[PDB]
Design a binder for these strands. Structure first.
Ligand SMILES: [Mg+2]
Ligand SMILES: [Mg+2]
Ligand SMILES: [Mg+2]
Ligand SMILES: [Mg+2]
Ligand SMILES: [Mg+2]
Ligand SMILES: [Mg+2]
Ligand SMILES: [Mg+2]
Ligand SMILES: [Mg+2]
Ligand SMILES: [Mg+2]
Lengths: 127, 79, 96, 151, 206, 98
RNA sequence: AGAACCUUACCUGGUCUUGACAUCCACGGAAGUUUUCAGAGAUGAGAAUGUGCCUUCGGGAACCGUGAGACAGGUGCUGCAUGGCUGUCGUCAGCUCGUGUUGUGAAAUGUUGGGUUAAGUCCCGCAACGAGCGCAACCCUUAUCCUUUGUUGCCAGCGGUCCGGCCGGGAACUCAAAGGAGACUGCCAGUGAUAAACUGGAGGAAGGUGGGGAUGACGUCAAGUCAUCAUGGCCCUUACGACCAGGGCUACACACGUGCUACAAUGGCGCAUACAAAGAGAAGCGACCUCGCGAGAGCAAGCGGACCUCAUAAAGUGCGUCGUAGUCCGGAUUGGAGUCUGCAACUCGACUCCAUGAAGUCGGAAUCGCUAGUAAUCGUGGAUCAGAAUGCCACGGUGAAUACGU
């Protein structure tokens, strides 16, 4: 049987699977380095898998849509932590300290009337 | 530049141009329309363009075919 | 809002079906790169107030020529007066 | 900031080396909110630093930053109609914060080619001091000692 | 003064509808015209009839017009004498086969438009505004209405300057969204000046 | 075949209109997959709140257009009866097309 | 929420006077669809056809023309007569009334205090006891899960494969939206008059009004709008009205505000390449295809819309070029030659093509905004609209610094 976990980050929905086989990274029928992840947010996908005994532990298939570079990257970060239901509620207690299970409630602010974008009040003449 | 294919003019003013050729030129005609363009047949014919007060005597010349009638009557008076 | 301008508007709108719409098929297909004769362009001595995009599109109640929405068919001031009295279905205070 | 004291939120560390100090450094260098183009300049400067000086990677910029740490700073009073400057001991959180700022501001005044090179030249003359940041660090210190009166 | 209009703010929360009709954006502009056009003649015909409110709707190439009233006798009359004349001209203006309903509003003091029309009609009679406003107040807690208030605006007793001088009795929660607030604005046609008549009526909690 | 798409503006009106069509069909007939929720189009307008001046102060408006799809898979001659003209239309538009 | 005519009021001309628009009287003519001459047009003067649903014969209801008076008309005057609606102090926490008491009385008390909060929030106390407005809550949206539903959405486990969810099929899941659960200082610890509350921790996706919006008290500035409408009074009334052409609203020795694009190597230019959301669309958005360097034109499917169309989003990233200059920085201005919308682009347009390449190399005193997905930066869409956004509204991408203090 498969092991599922959702996660998302700023309107970027992801779908993580974990299986016991080889350590190859398949994302949207493409490799990890061939998913252009060279600069910042290079290893934020493997951020929840930092403090574990790994060597070459798991298969993974991940597919993310919506947002941009870091929006899709941070969706995989939170998506894998929900996909740890193979290891169930044991290893999450240590992962509570890191705060990767925390779904970030920060979303882009709506544009407001009489403001340039959400906060910036346009300037005025002297006093 | 503008008007795409074919030089757009007014109908009523074309009859005045044909009047100046067939019946012959007499005096400068007082025309309110600035929309029409100058042609080769309009060369050597006196015309007059309205511009918010009274018709200005604009003399037509060989090289004026490239521009409109409205350019030769300045609307806004200065100084 | 000056009922003579609305009388001028009712005239302007009522000429759209007669002079143009039906007989405005001329200049669309006829004036094109075909086969020229300039006699088709000499049919523009028509009254001109029939023109398809001439109207300001005034508000139907008052006759204000500003803030006219195509959806409601009313000016911005009459939108608030109407909307707060209901009348437009499924309309309420927008907040998201 | 009158009643409500802040929670001092923690940024994420540098993904390559693992230094939380360099995570703040890339943010000062960052302009127009472009972190991708920011780090490309920072890493290019750090590789040229350790190669030229012939020192280790992490402690090259650290010792260079340690030299540009300000000893003390002053605060404007404005109490009884006359402006008084009172010297105060800068905290370790604010010490490196102002240090990383004055490196970028000193590098901004140079007339060199790339931002990686001109910043690396500022890091190169941090250990032995001829640069603009080492001139910028000693400004309030000349005003200090005279202002020791007010305390 | 600046306030949110009580009727509009309570559309999403605790009002039924002033329009239940659906229409597409193509014919919406022309359809919304006919809904205000029919009310111009209908409010004139139901001026002396003391109409509270009417609900326009058009169920698939038709028209209903659900008419409430304080006085059901004058609206209905003997059989369909006054019913047929109203239904005829609505079909002509709308351009569709029109029906008609009937509805009796018990306790006319509870409605906003009925009390607003009651106060403003007395201004042409030339009676004292202090008494005219108080006659609406005097029967508040007797039959329904847990709270109520009335406001007049400008030209108080033929004065040279414009005063307000509002009055209130009971609980009128203006910004409580769950609270049932009935409201309607009205104006006077008096030759000494224009007096606006606003009345806020609170029925219950839910 | 029996593809019927609805439209309604209110936050809860069509929910009761699309309920009655289900239990009428599936009782005498069979199948009837049920009401598809469908994406809501929201036409957001903004108009000036004051009659004169006041650029900063405005009022925002919206009209939510909620769609539903019936999808009956069983065309029987019994279930087509007692479907038409027991809808009791409360201004909800109904259309019969592919 | 958009002056090329129109809009449009105002100006110089040409015109009409019971009028452009509405009621009513008398009289004639169906209305209307056809054409020609003159005029810039408003318009007069002809030749055609037509003469339709009721009518003891005086006539009708639609519309046109003529004539006479009641009138119609006014974006004209007064927001120091007004309605309606709105700015701002201010989303600041205040502002008041019943009875009672105090002072001869204006008024006070309540609502003076002691803690606490975003808050007249709550506790205790009190010569006051209560009530109401406001605040908070109820609401919309957003953070999470469950139930209900599976097309046009989605593709794990299965196979058939043109390696396209494309086609059975599977309905998990993402997305989508109806109804619910959950966050209440409640569980624990400490402090505090043992009460309110505060600090900290556990659990939890979200902890102390979660984030944001709607929601703007009593009143003030005789604040703004007689020009949206409504409306008192006043005034014009063969004119300040009405119709039409052209003009102006876009002027130019100047001053100021509000924005855009810059002065560059965190960048320019060229090739290649990856990831959005919110929309709008039938008098419309316009594939695919062909032509043109291009704006666009012709031909021309599909979809009233999770399908089809605008739509190939850009920053970013991979190589190369440029190496500090008034330059491959910047685009102004001007010339030549085009497209598009429309009766119409000259006054007075958008956009494209070739060429020209002003000023400016971080801006004096002074001044403006913002405390977290915010500042800033790079793009998209909509309303307005035939056709003109750098404005406005709406949406998303990348994404900080610093808050010791009053
Ligand atoms: Mg009028
Ligand atoms: Mg127009
Ligand atoms: Mg004009
Ligand atoms: Mg004024
Ligand atoms: Mg007091
Ligand atoms: Mg209170
Ligand atoms: Mg509130
Ligand atoms: Mg005033
Ligand atoms: Mg250039």
């Amino acid at each position: 049987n498969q092991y599922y976990g959702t996660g998302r980050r700023k309107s970027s929905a992801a779908r993580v699977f974990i299986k016991p086989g080889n350590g190859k990274i398949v994302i949207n029928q493409r490799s990890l380095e061939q998913y252009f992840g060279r600069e910042t947010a290079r290893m934020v996908v493997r951020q929840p898998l930092e403090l574990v005994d790994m060597v070459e532990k798991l298969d993974l298939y991940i597919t993310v849509k919506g947002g941009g570079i870091s929006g899709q990257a941070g969706a995989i970060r939170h998506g894998i932590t929900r996909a740890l239901m193979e290891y169930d509620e044991s290893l999450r207690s240590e992962l509570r300290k890191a705060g990767f299970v925390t779904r970030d409630a920060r979303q882009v602010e709506r544009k407001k009337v009489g403001l340039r974008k959400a906060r910036r009040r346009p300037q005025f003449s002297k006093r | 530049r503008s008007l795409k294919k074919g030089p757009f003019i007014d109908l009523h003013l074309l009859k005045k141009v044909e009047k100046a050729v067939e019946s012959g030129d007499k005096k400068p005609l007082r025309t309110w329309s600035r929309r029409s363009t100058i042609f080769p047949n309009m060369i050597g014919l006196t015309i007059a363009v309205h511009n918010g007060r009274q018709h200005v005597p604009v003399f037509v010349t060989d090289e004026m075919v490239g521009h409109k009638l409205g350019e030769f009557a300045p609307t806004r008076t200065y100084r | 809002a000056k009922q003579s301008m609305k009388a001028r508007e009712v005239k302007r709108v009522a000429l759209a079906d007669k002079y143009f719409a039906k007989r405005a098929e001329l200049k669309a297909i006829i004036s094109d790169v075909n086969a020229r004769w300039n006699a088709v362009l000499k049919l523009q001595t028509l009254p001109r107030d029939s023109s398809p995009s001439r109207q300001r599109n005034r508000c139907r109640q008052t006759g204000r020529p500003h803030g006219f929405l195509r959806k409601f068919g009313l000016s911005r001031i009459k939108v608030r007066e109407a909307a707060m009295r209901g009348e437009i279905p499924g309309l309420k205070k927008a907040s998201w | 900031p009158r009643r409500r004291v802040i929670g001092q939120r923690k940024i994420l560390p540098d993904p390559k080396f693992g230094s939380e100090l360099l995570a703040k450094f890339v943010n000062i260098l960052m302009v127009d909110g472009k972190k991708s183009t920011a780090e490309s300049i920072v890493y290019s400067a750090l590789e040229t630093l350790a190669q030229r000086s012939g020192k280790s990677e992490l402690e090259a910029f650290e010792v260079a930053l340690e030299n540009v740490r300000p000893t003390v700073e002053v605060k404007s009073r404005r109490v009884g109609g006359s402006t008084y400057q009172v010297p105060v001991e800068v905290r370790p959180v604010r010490r490196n914060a102002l240090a990383m700022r004055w490196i970028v501001e000193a590098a901004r005044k140079r007339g060199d080619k790339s931002m990686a090179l001109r910043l690396a030249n500022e890091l190169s003359d941090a250990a032995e001091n001829k640069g603009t940041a080492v001139k910028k660090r000693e400004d309030v210190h000349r005003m200090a000692e005279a202002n020791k009166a007010f305390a | 003064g600046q306030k949110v209009h009580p009727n509009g703010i309570r559309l999403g929360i605790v009002k039924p509808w002033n329009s239940t009709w659906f229409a597409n954006t193509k014919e919406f502009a022309d359809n919304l015209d006919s809904d205000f056009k029919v009310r111009q003649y209908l409010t004139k015909e139901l001026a002396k009839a003391s109409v509270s409110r009417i609900v326009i709707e058009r169920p698939a190439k038709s028209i209903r017009v659900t008419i409430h009233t304080a006085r059901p006798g004058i609206v209905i009359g003997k059989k369909g004498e006054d019913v047929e004349k109203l239904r005829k001209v609505v079909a002509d203006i709308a351009g569709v086969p029109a029906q008609i309903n009937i509805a009796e509003v018990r306790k006319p003091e509870l409605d906003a438009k009925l009390v607003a029309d009651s106060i403003t009609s007395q201004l042409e009679r030339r009676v004292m505004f202090r008494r005219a406003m108080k006659r609406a107040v005097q029967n508040a807690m007797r039959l329904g209405a847990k709270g109520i208030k009335v406001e007049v605006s400008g030209r108080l007793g033929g004065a040279e300057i414009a005063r307000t001088e509002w009055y209130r009795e009971g609980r009128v929660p203006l910004h409580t969204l769950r609270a049932d607030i009935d409201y309607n604005t009205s104006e006077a046609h008096t030759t000494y000046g224009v007096i606006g008549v606003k009345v806020w009526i609170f029925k219950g909690e839910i | 075949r029996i593809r019927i798409r609805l439209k309604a503006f209110d936050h809860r009106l069509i929910d009761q209109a699309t309920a009655e069509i289900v239990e009428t069909a599936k009782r005498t007939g069979a199948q009837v997959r049920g009401p598809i929720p469908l994406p809501t189009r929201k036409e957001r307008f903004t108009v000036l709140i004051s009659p004169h001046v006041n650029k900063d102060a405005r009022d925002q408006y919206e009209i939510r257009t909620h769609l539903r799809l019936v999808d009956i898979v069983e065309p029987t001659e019994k279930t087509v009866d007692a479907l038409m003209r027991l809808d009791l239309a409360a201004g909800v538009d109904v259309q019969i097309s592919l």
